[PDB]
Amino acid sequence: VDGIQAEMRAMMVEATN
Amino acid sequence: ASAARRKEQELERSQEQALREKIDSVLLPILGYGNYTAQVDIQMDFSAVEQTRKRFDPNTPATRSEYALEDYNGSVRKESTRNFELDTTISHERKQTGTVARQTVSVAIKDRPMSESEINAIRQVLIGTVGFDQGRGDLLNVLSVKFA
Amino acid sequence: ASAARRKEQELERSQEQALREKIDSVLLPILGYGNYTAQVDIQMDFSAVEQTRKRFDPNTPATRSEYALEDYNGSVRKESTRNFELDTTISHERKQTGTVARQTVSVAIKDRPMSESEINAIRQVLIGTVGFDQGRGDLLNVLSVKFA
Amino acid sequence: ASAARRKEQELERSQEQALREKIDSVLLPILGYGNYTAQVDIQMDFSAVEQTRKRFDPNTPATRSEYALEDYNGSVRKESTRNFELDTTISHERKQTGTVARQTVSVAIKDRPMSESEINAIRQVLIGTVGFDQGRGDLLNVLSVKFA
Amino acid sequence: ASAARRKEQELERSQEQALREKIDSVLLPILGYGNYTAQVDIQMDFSAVEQTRKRFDPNTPATRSEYALEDYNGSVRKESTRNFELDTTISHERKQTGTVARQTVSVAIKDRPMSESEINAIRQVLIGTVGFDQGRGDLLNVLSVKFA
Amino acid sequence: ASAARRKEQELERSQEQALREKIDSVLLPILGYGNYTAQVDIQMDFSAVEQTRKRFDPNTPATRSEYALEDYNGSVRKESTRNFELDTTISHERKQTGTVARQTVSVAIKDRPMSESEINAIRQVLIGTVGFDQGRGDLLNVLSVKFA
Amino acid sequence: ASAARRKEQELERSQEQALREKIDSVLLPILGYGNYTAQVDIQMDFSAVEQTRKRFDPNTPATRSEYALEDYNGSVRKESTRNFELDTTISHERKQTGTVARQTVSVAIKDRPMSESEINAIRQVLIGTVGFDQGRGDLLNVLSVKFA
């Protein structure tokens, strides 16, 4: 849910970095 | 879905058969043909657990911004504002459906009885032959009985 | 849906038959042909439980932002504002429909009676032959009766 | 829907027949042919229960945000505001329609009578042969009567 | 998905077979043909863990902007505002599905018994032959038993 | 994905075979044909780590803009505002999937035993023949056993 | 990607083969045919590092604009505003994927033994024959063993 979406956003931050 | 339940029963029976085959492959040389009997019960859970954990680290914060006002006169006013950054772990786990939740194995050895030392040695071989896991709730009985 | 109920009855009967087959495979060598009789009752629940748990960790909070005003004069004013981050576990479980809720096994051994030691040994073999689970409410009776 | 009720009656009768078959399979060797009679009544509920439970954990709250004002002068003002996060379990269960709500079994044994010990032994075999469940309200009568 | 579970069972059995082949390749020259028996149990987890960690470095901050007001009169007012930059590591890990969670190996050596020194030497060879990992919970039994 | 797991098993077995080939290529001249036996276990991790690190240099800041007000009267007011530029390293690393996490090698030498000096010399040759890495957790056993 | 891992294994094996060829080309004239054996282990990292560094020069700033107010009365007010320009280096590096992270070479020389001086001379030749790099963690063993 919200926590999983936050995890996905963190992975997206990783990809952008 | 009842077909799925049928195939789950098939999976459990297949596991039991494989364990019985291994038991035979170990005990047939050691004991001989027809000098033992063994049966195996395997109970398998088929839940659909799916867990998401979000863990922090309270004891190692990193200050991002900070304000600190400290005036005197007597009067002593100590205002403070602080923002922190914390270690954040987000783990999403998805367990496998069918897992052996409990395993029961019983072996009966034909008399002519067997000494305690050899019974315990056979038990030690089986532990490892079957993958005995007491912490899982598994049970392993080895008895010396009189075959008719 | 009544066809589904019929197939559930079929599943229960199949489980009972399999357990009876295992009982025979164990007792036929030990006791012989026609020296025993055994029947098995298996009750299976077919509910559709589906649970979602959201658990926190009260004892390890991590401060995210913090404000603290503490002025003196006498007068002592201690204002404070605090925001926390907590460990959050979110687990979604979906139980399997048909699960053995209770298992009953009874075995009767033909007399000529049987000693208590051998009765208990047969009981020990069955425990593991069938997968006896007392905590589930299962029941296992072994008696020595007079066949006609 | 009356066709559904007819098939429910068929299900109940099929269950009774299966239990009678098991009773015969157990008692025919033990007692013999024509030395006993047994009949089984099975009452099955066909409701459509569907429950949703939302449970919390009052004794382990986790503070999310917190405000606390405590000033002195005498005058003592203690303001406080607190927000909590609680363990939340949400379970949706859907019971199976047809469930055996009560089971009645009666067995009559032909005289030449039977001793109390053997009557109780037969009762013990039946308990497990049928899956006797007293907590469900089931009833099991074993009598020794004079056949004509 | 039950086909996937079947293929997982196949993977586990294949691993066990490979380990048995290696055990044979080591022990057949050392002990001989038919002087030993060995069986291997391999339990493999098939979860789908996927973790994201965001870690900071509290003890090495770098000041980005800074304001500092410090006036006297007596009265001493020390205002301060500070912004920091911190070391930020963001690691996304995705574990492999099937991993050997526990490994059990048992080897039985035919008597004519074996001395403790040679038993321990065989155990040392197996440690490395199989890849014994006690920290994983693996178990390795080597016994000297009497073959029939 | 289970096909991928199968090919991972194939990769591990291929690595083990290659290491065994190298072991043979070294020991066959030194010891001879049939005077030794050796087996290799290779455990390979197949995670998907992908890390991003953003590191600063706190101890060498460079002032970009600066304001400094310092008035006296007695009263001493020292206002100051400062902006900094810092060394910024941003490294994105992506680890290779399959990496040897632990390596176990065991070699058994046929007796007629071997002296400690030659055992240690063989161990030294193997260290470098296999690429022994103790810091990785690798293990290398060399024993002198009695072949049958 | 597993095909990529296979080709990485091929690259490592090719490197090892080339180093072995060079070792032979050096030692075959010096020692002779069949008087030595040597094996090479090469471990290669295949990460995907990609770094961006932004470095400044704190100790050589260049003032771009400047304001300075300095009034007296007693009262002494010293206001100042300053803007700086700094040396800025921005380097983007992208490391090559496959790099030899550790290299292990072991050479065994047939006895009839070899003196320490000649062993060290052979070691010196190999250092340069292989490109020995101790700072990388490489290891080079040269032993005098008894060939069978």
UniProtKB/TrEMBL annotation, chains B, C, D, E, F, G:
Highest rank taxon of the organism: Bacteria
Biased composition (Basic and acidic residues): 5-15
Places the protein is found: Bacterial flagellum basal body; Cell membrane
Subunit structure as annotated in this protein's UniProt entry: The basal body constitutes a major portion of the flagellar organelle and consists of four rings (L,P,S, and M) mounted on a central rod. The M ring is integral to the inner membrane of the cell and may be connected to the flagellar rod via the S ring. The S (supramembrane ring) lies just distal to the M ring. The L and P rings lie in the outer membrane and the periplasmic space, respectively.
Its biological purpose: The M ring may be actively involved in energy transduction.
Family, similarity comment: Belongs to the FliF family.
Name under which the protein is recorded: Flagellar M-ring protein
Species of origin: Vibrio alginolyticus
Parent-protein residues present: 255 to 452 of 580
